[PDB]
């Protein structure tokens, strides 16, 4: 198996994790299980704590930065790690029992269980024009040395790292999302009927989207061309609320539909951050420089749910449009964008792999 790790500036403390992206379903959220490597001597009476903060920040580009103009803590979890507190004691994963047995006795566990209905790691990076500042919700894991809880944490023997809460939806049976509209122009009751659908409700980053477009033209006009698009919507709803709208995929085609005939076709779009990187105002599931970053996924929420508490609400839509030689006739279908997903361990850094940038 493979596990990531990171050490404190003075290598006296070292965190060990088997993932840096925790997959949350709806029922449950993969548990955040890791262990610390301590130097009992180095810290006399001092202790080892590990905390999981979940918060929304606005202004800077991360929680640890001291230039953000707003912050709301959405979750916090502290655990007395070194001095094993019989109180704060749990069952233990296997990657743990495994790890502890390779690190020794100075190996100590900790485990965090993230409530199912908390927002997922989402970051919205403002453009050049946009008057808003960056913001997002991040999960910070911090293990540190101190006697009491409160003493002053020092960047010296403390370690910090951002993990990720990614959303996965299993794809159900349901009907394909449909949308239709009829249009009658000036001086005639002859209609132009549009109707589209997507092959399914749930998609995953990188997974293609198929659009079945059917056009019934009883009109005496002509459909010049057809434009298919996939837009993203981001509603920052906390410090300084605003709504960002951004296209993540377009596919215009010179398809023609003659007077009194029926048209039919299947288009394929692929929303990919790669072909949008140089864009801004959109929401991502991380920072741009990181390679393992995608487009922010659809914010889920159902019945009596607090919307502000989620930070940034994200949604997607596919728009179909016919340019008729005017007023185009169009429809739109909403979809959900989700996330995919005798050993030997072998530690590896925690830092997220980078891009290519000049």
Count of helical regions: 1
Largest sheet: 7 strands, mixed
Terminal residue distance? 34 Å
CATH topology description of the largest domain: Immunoglobulin-like
The total of beta strands comes to 21
C-alpha-based Rg, rounded: 25 Å
- Percentage of residues assigned to helices: under 10%
| Domain module count | 2
What spatial form do the alpha-carbon principal axes imply? elongated
CATH architecture of the largest domain: Sandwich
Percentage of residues in strands = over 45%
CATH class of the largest domain: Mainly Beta
* Backbone structural class: mainly beta
What is the N-to-C order of secondary-structure elements (H for helix, E for strand)?
EEEEEEHEEEEEEEEEEEEEEE
GO molecular function, one term: AP-2 adaptor complex binding
Protein name: Beta-arrestin-1
Motif ([DE]-X(1,2)-F-X-X-[FL]-X-X-X-R motif): 344-354
InterPro entries: Arrestin, Arrestin-like_C, Arrestin-like_N, Arrestin_C-like, Arrestin_CS, Arrestin_N, Ig_E-set
Overview of the molecule:
The protein has one helix spanning 94-103; strands at 3-7, 14-17, 21-24, 32-37, 47-59, 70-80, 107-112, 122-124, 134-146, 159-167, 178-184, 191-198, 202-204, 209-217, 223-236, 242-253, 262-269, 283-284, 312-324, 329-338, 347-348. It is mainly beta and 358 residues long. The protein folds into two domains: 2-171, Immunoglobulin-like (Sandwich), CATH 2.60.40; 174-345, Sandwich (Immunoglobulin-like), CATH 2.60.40.640. The protein starts with a strand and ends in a 10-residue tail after the last strand. A motif ([DE]-X(1,2)-F-X-X-[FL]-X-X-X-R motif) lies at residues 344-354. GO terms for molecular function: acetylcholine receptor binding; AP-2 adaptor complex binding; clathrin binding; clathrin heavy chain binding; G protein-coupled receptor binding; inositol hexakisphosphate binding; molecular adaptor activity; phosphatidylinositol-3,4,5-trisphosphate binding. It comes from Bos taurus. This is Beta-arrestin-1.
